[PDB]
Design a protein around this ligand. Structure first.
Ligand SMILES: *Cc1ccc(-n2cnc(C)c2)cc1
Ligand SMILES: *Cc1ccc(-n2cnc(C)c2)cc1
Ligand SMILES: [Ca+2]
Ligand SMILES: [Ca+2]
Ligand SMILES: [Cl-]
Ligand SMILES: [Cl-]
Lengths: 6, 228, 228, 6
């Protein structure tokens, strides 16, 4: 659910 | 399999594969380029990272779908197929980690390259940790932690707080803390401290660098909003 | 490669692969199911079609990106990589056509099954025609035409004008006329006639069948709007 | 550009 780098 | 193709041709074809959204091909081309034995430029490191992030990203999404179906059920088919996808994911992670260990990291002397590769190493151990359940789960988690930690130490000594690699590293290490290490307070503290020190350094940046840095700071803010 | 897995397990795993959006796996599972030698149910035919349509669809999209780059250019890399993707696409088409010929079509006696497989045969010859440039381009086009035509003849004798397979067949045969055969007037005439006769038969349908048929009639209308 | 069945 949380954002890692993209 | 790429040993007979020129390095420059592998790089050019990796860029073509990206445009065609053929990320498996892209990763194979960049693997071949790495195996030429020369260090990678900044642009080339990004191509390597984008290729494998997209490949493993699709595997992780599929694994999560199948794992969810498996939990709701618990014949052998759901488990068997989840295991198949999981094994393919672990193989891709092992391939990336093998490229980092032979010999990208040991030849990376500059902060931008070394932090980039160590962040990658933390990421792919994190992906292994997401599916790990056996006697090596703790060691896999500590391998992710160790790689992230060394990257953090170098980045804090050698890069400004707004550096996009430094920011993306902190973002992912905070996700590691929250999702893998069961340390949500550490995750929140790292994200907030990273965001605040970046905020205070934005005044030194050009318009283009400002856009690069604020883009990643927004992801830190999104997580903080999700977590608090 | 699937010879040791149960037919039912292959079908179940094909459905899991669809949920995971793993269409390559899905196609491999359905290929294994076909090679068990038993006829396919309506649901199983749909699984086969969905799997390969998605696989070849990604290849066609990539081929179009690369072909566009190749035209704007005209080293060998762009052509080489376009040829690689093109060869992989032709291999998938040949695999599907091989399954239809050995032995899906010859055992398909019912109109719903036979028209379905002949439509598939027309479609995959159409995909071969999209990339064909050599001495066999005309024969490939006529193979698509012949398969579509036999499917049309059966569908007009054996199915109502609102039958979704009949409608999708006419839609794709009209696209064949417009894009492959350089017959835009034939494409428009077929789409309009198909739409109008379906319109006149909607009153016989239940609410669910009405939704199925009008969905595909909308695609016919979209093309007519694009073409006129 | 035109729609085939999907
Ligand atoms: C892991 C990571 C973080 C940030 C970047 N990035 C974004 N924009 C630039 C110039 C660098 C790449 C990779
Ligand atoms: C080629 C084709 C056309 C239409 C269908 N379809 C859609 N809805 C149903 C029940 C059948 C499948 C394949
Ligand atoms: Ca060096
Ligand atoms: Ca039969
Ligand atoms: Cl399996
Ligand atoms: Cl190639």
């Amino acid at each position: 659910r949380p954002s890692s780098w993209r | 399999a790429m040993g007979s193709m020129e390095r420059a041709s592998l790089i050019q074809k990796a860029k073509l594969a990206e445009q065609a959204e053929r990320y498996e091909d892209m990763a194979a081309f960049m693997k071949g380029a790495v195996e030429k034995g020369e260090e990678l430029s900044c642009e080339e490191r990004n191509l390597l990272s984008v290729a494998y992030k997209n490949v493993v990203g699709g595997q992780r999404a599929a694994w999560r779908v199948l794992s969810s179906i498996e939990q709701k059920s618990n014949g052998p088919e759901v488990r068997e197929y989840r295991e198949k996808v999981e094994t393919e994911l672990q193989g891709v992670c092992d391939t990336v980690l093998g490229l980092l260990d032979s010999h990208l990291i040991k030849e990376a002397g500059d902060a931008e390259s070394r932090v980039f590769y160590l962040k990658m190493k933390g990421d792919y151990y994190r992906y292994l940790a997401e599916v790990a359940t056996g006697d090596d789960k703790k060691r896999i988690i500590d391998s992710a932690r160790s790689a992230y930690q060394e990257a953090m130490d170098i980045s804090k000594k050698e890069m400004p707080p707004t550096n996009p690699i430094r920011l993306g590293l902190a973002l992912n290490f905070s996700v590691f803390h929250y999702e893998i290490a069961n340390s949500p307070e550490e995750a929140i503290s790292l994200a907030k401290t990273t965001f605040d020190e970046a905020m205070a350094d934005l005044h030194t940046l050009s318009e283009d660098s400002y856009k690069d840095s604020t883009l990643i700071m927004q992801l830190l803010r999104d997580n903080l909003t999700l977590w608090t």
